[PDB]
């Protein structure tokens, strides 16, 4: 009806995502958990996400990034920054991109925020993202886990590919990755 699709769709270009390897050290800005397919990172800090394709998409292709809440009761809810951090790219977007010809969008009907940039070939091509609010921000995500959905679209906005990963923006990525990974081990 309204909640955007999160369905993995590699498409004709064999679109997959990749992530740099990092420790679980209490001193790590951004670390990825392949086990949980989840990224842990600090507020406003480089989050490298890799774009991998089997066949180079035609020039004019774009890469969109959008967050949605992972839980059902919250999915129809629009993910945005808490008013606290908004009072300090448009200030209401949670996901930014550091580097380009980055375009920010506020869909006038879903009200959803998204950030898109021109797709460039690499071997993979890396995009640097920034999450501007902690997962626990009162008034914003408010402890609700999110999913970042990355979509590969044509010059016109048609779906060419889609992928996603869960995100937790927090003070101690390393510390939390380890904890949630242990959390897995047993009930």
């Amino acid at each position: 009806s309204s909640v955007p699709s999160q369905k993995t769709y590699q498409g004709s270009y064999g679109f997959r995502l990749g992530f740099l390897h990092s420790g679980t050290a209490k001193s790590v800005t951004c670390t990825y958990s392949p086990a949980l397919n989840k990224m842990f990172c600090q507020l406003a800090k480089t989050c490298p996400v890799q774009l991998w394709v089997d066949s180079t998409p035609p020039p004019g292709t774009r890469v969109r990034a959008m967050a949605i809440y992972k839980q059902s009761q919250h999915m129809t809810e629009v993910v945005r920054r808490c008013p606290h951090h908004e009072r300090c790219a448009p200030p209401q977007h949670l996901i930014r991109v550091e580097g380009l010809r980055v375009e920010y969008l506020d869909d006038r009907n879903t009200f959803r925020h998204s950030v898109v940039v021109p797709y460039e070939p690499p071997e993979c091509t890396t995009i640097h993202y920034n999450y501007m609010c902690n997962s626990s921000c009162m008034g914003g995500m408010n402890r609700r886990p999110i999913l970042t959905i990355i979509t590969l679209e044509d010059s016109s906005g048609n779906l060419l590919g889609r992928n996603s990963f869960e995100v937790r923006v927090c003070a101690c990525p390393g510390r939390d990755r380890r904890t949630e990974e242990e959390n897995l081990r047993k009930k």
Binding site: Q71, Q73, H74, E77, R80, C82, P83, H84, M138, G139, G140, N142, R143, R144
Partner: protein
């Protein structure tokens, strides 16, 4: 500040008890101040729990108070005072769903659980309340159990007498250490579960009816 900012809304305010704040590891919120901001916007202040208004509970954190349990039991959303803050500041109602407070600490999960839509956890439950606290127990859990969907709640004073209590019509006995030993023995023979108030509370936190014996603190005589 818009004088009609909160018009149409009714509010319940609650302060985390000292034991709630105590379990730390396991502007500050001011009831009077927030009330003033609420009234200034035509907000209706409910001094106690009760169709013409959208009700909301305001607190600075999840707590174990009569008012909190009543709202968990009745579906009145528990919202953080910051929703009042941000709304006044912006002079525009924010979406409270971005300020929901957690339900509480779960014994089972061993962590603070978030709140999610649920079905009346005591639906069609017929319970017997036994205690010598005619106010902080019999009266308190009775109202909570009922607004939580119970089919009925029979209040029985521990120091009273068994001349009408047909235990076999009940689904569960919610009591405390003052429970007469004759009632415990009968319950056992009839295989009628007997639990402490923590079972009720956990049911509200978790959001569904949970194990009568899923945890030691559910035993009626759990002391300290």
């Amino acid at each position: 500040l818009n004088k009609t900012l909160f018009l149409g809304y009714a509010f319940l305010l609650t302060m985390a008890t000292t034991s709630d704040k105590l379990a730390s590891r396991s502007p500050p919120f001011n009831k009077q101040y927030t009330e003033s901001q609420l009234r200034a916007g035509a907000g209706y202040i409910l001094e106690d729990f009760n169709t013409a208004y959208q009700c909301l509970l305001i607190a600075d954190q999840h707590c174990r108070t009569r008012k909190y349990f009543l709202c968990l039991a009745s579906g009145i959303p528990c919202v953080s005072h910051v929703w009042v803050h941000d709304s006044c500041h912006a002079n525009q109602l924010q979406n409270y769903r971005n300020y929901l407070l957690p339900a509480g600490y779960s014994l089972e999960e061993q962590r603070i659980l978030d709140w999610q839509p649920r079905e009346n956890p005591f639906q069609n439950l017929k319970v017997l309340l036994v205690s010598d606290q005619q106010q902080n127990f019999l009266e308190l859990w009775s109202e909570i159990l009922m607004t939580g969907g119970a089919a009925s709640v029979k209040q029985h004073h521990s120091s009273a007498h068994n001349k009408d209590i047909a235990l076999g019509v009940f689904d569960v006995v919610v009591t405390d250490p003052s429970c007469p030993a004759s009632v415990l023995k009968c319950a056992e023979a009839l295989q009628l579960p007997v639990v402490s108030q923590e079972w009720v509370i956990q049911c509200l936190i978790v959001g569904e009816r949970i194990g009568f014996k899923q945890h030691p603190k559910y035993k009626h005589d759990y002391v300290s």
